[PDB]
Write an enzyme that holds these catalytic residues in place. Structure first.
Site, short mmCIF file in Angstrom:
data_model
loop_
_atom_site.label_atom_id
_atom_site.label_comp_id
_atom_site.label_asym_id
_atom_site.label_seq_id
_atom_site.Cartn_x
_atom_site.Cartn_y
_atom_site.Cartn_z
CB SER A 173 -0.76 -0.06 1.46
OG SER A 173 -2.08 -1.32 1.41
CG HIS A 215 3.70 -0.04 -6.96
ND1 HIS A 215 5.10 0.49 -5.73
CD2 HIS A 215 2.58 0.00 -5.24
CE1 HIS A 215 4.82 0.09 -4.19
NE2 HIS A 215 3.41 -0.74 -4.24
N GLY A 216 5.52 1.35 -10.20
CA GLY A 216 6.26 1.00 -11.40
C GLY A 216 7.54 0.31 -11.46
CB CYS A 234 9.93 2.71 -8.59
SG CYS A 234 10.36 3.01 -7.39
#
Lengths: 4, 234, 234, 4, 234, 234, 4, 4
Positions: free
Chosen positions: C35, C93-94, C135
């Site tokens: 999370s 997120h990435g 990211c």
């Protein structure tokens, strides 16, 4: 024209 | 003294700095890479442009992948204490994240890592500019160690970059023209933005091959700079 | 009329445009993604910031990969004739070139392609800004269809991006603070440059894990814009 | 501090 | 002597060789990676399986990226003169070309390069097997220095790999079962082909999340071997 | 009937199947790609080899990226009900995951996806073989929809692949020789393993350029097959 | 069932 | 010898  | 601001890079050091131009025109036959006709026009254009900006220009021609790395390593080991910045121009074939030596590819990260804030102390906090005229694919249209780097890419990620055999590359032609006209007036990002507009509006490919005909191009400014950059001072 | 210049984007249309904020905090358990504590602080900060810039803000929370694509497709099919620009903020997120939906990844190209000059005519020639807090890896520290795009990446290519569970992400905190202070004074690239300096100098990670401790970050401005961008006009 |  | 053929690897050396099992279950909180429930079942299954094949098994648990590299480097510097082959099993999170240490990623090439024909002479000409249970993306369903390597991937390129919290991973469960049943009868490629069929036909995911529900998997055998490999001899 | 085993693909259908050979020798000047001297030797070698295996060979020469996709799409839409398998041979320039049309690249995934178990029902459960003679970089030395695919790569991931202007490519020369000698005796993986050994031991580059001189090569077998494959039956 |  |  030419590409690299 | 009066109120002081630190919004722009200190460009009044004794020397503006080095401007390393790697001009790769002829490649080893085994690589299967074509000769980059017109790149000499670019190299000469850049030499003159940066000469007027007071950079110590060093033009290198047809360097192998080994020579490129060695040159960059050696340059990064020099004492840049009295230099305001660093400029490296790469003119060659390429792919995304790669630039070609005359005998094979060189990871762009390999080259740029030599100048990281922790690896080249005499350049820490100073602008490190990498201008790259090379394809980035085949599509047609304490401080961070990575801080203070500016990558002026000739084309967007994943795209081919255009070069005219007679006039030189679209990007370099435009870059030099904008630097000549605005280097004593505008901040660097604004100059590169003019370069983007010039390339995007004044050029279109003409090819006997429908696949490569009537194509457009848009450069790609990648900034990790922490301050404004003016080539002029005081 | 007198001499006219076209160096800056026309930002005096009836509306500044949309500001789509995709705030992904909670992910499906099967993805194994944590999370994103503090992202709500970012979403609220951005909403307020862009509200003051007169953007029509639309905050979306916890969207699946399917919902993200559908939203972007639908938004790109709207009539932006009376809008000056377009802003899309992605908080999730990435990985390099990827942003995560709550149930899986979405190629950033997929999202941005909807707004290409030839696919969204009502936005052709207008600035399309994509602000990405995610990211981009795991390292620690006629006009071109791709023209008029600005990618304000929170971190350099291949690097993690930092987010504080209490104050929000380093990049978004800094971006909002700089927009609040300079949106009525400076051109956008200069504002993002201040953001770069703020992130690079005012933040350092604190972690009980030596691997992630005392790390720095530098945002990454990627510009394909063809004109200067001021949020204010006349 | 957490990474994304 | 009579007619001699060199179609299969010499597996009658004094020792079969090492079987290094890197079992990463718990990851540092900062990585944001989930605990790999069921991986202990896999590690134990592999230990027993390779023990019966007469391999010198060394089980390692929760190794950081630094420890993984150091271990592989050290192992590659050992004298494998009396060993027939080398086996390395990696159980962890991963991406295409990457395997995760407890605190961060490790390039698979980094690990495998230590055993290249020119870097580990005592293993030159001998089969070097790397069995990898890790995701390779997020999709759901003189001799060459690279010669003599076999990569038994749990899943196809770009795809997730499935692991059951109770029974262990689909691939490892199947691999061990096939090795137990056919190691004394079939050539290795044929054993891995049985593994492919077992995984592809006997497993299907069950998830409360529709996105991850009823998904299938197919392992991926990547062979750079130059001879047939039988675990038994004479 | 007596005990039945399903360890090998049913290869006794009325027809062995199609063998599509895409032979790209001459590329559009704009691509900057060299002519692949010797590839005609390969195409002829393959035609003869697969003819003896009873495959319905279709040789295609100099296809553009558009023609390649269209051909593969059309072929995948044919009724393969009476065919035992499918073979596609690609002879061209390439990069990792890419094969070149005469006017530009084609994602290998694009081509292979047409034959996925759910997209080409008449080939579901049947072996789909893709033999690729192309570079994969510049280094020098219900059932799963991805199931039943075999990729016989000429070289390891990230490496150049060698082609002799007079004798044809190292890989194709070796593949055809091994198929001719062992197609009526050995299972396909064992034949490809012989191909690996032949390429790795019998070939070494000779170049006037030290960079490309005395280099070796190792093919790369990538199997997602679920059964053994023998070209002969009953 | 969980992914790695 | 040539590369592809």
């Amino acid at each position: 024209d030419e590409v690299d | 003294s009066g109120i002081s601001l630190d919004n722009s890079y200190k460009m009044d050091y004794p020397e503006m700095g080095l401007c390393i131009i790697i001009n790769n025109k002829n490649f080893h036959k085994s690589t299967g890479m074509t000769s980059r006709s017109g790149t000499d026009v670019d190299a000469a254009n850049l030499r003159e442009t940066f000469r007027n900006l007071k950079y110590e220009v060093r033009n290198k021609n047809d360097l192998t992948r080994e020579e490129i790395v060695e040159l960059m390593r050696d340059v990064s080991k020099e004492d840049h204490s009295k230099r305001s910045s660093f400029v490296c121009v790469l003119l060659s074939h390429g792919e995304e994240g790669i630039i070609f030596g005359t005998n094979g590819p060189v990871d762009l990260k390999k080259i740029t890592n030599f100048f990281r804030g922790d690896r080249c102390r005499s350049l820490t906090g100073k602008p490190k500019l990498f201008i790259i005229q090379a394809c980035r694919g085949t599509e047609l249209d304490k401080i961070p160690v990575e801080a203070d780097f500016l990558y002026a890419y000739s084309t967007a990620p994943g795209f081919y970059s255009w070069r005219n055999s007679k006039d030189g590359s679209w990007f370099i032609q435009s870059l030099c023209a904008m630097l000549k006209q605005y280097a004593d007036k505008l901040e660097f990002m604004h100059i590169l933005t003019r370069v983007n507009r010039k390339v995007a509006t004044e050029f279109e490919s003409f090819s006997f091959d429908a696949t490569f005909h009537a194509k457009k191009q848009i450069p790609c400014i990648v900034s990790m700079l922490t301050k404004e950059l003016y080539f002029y001072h005081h």
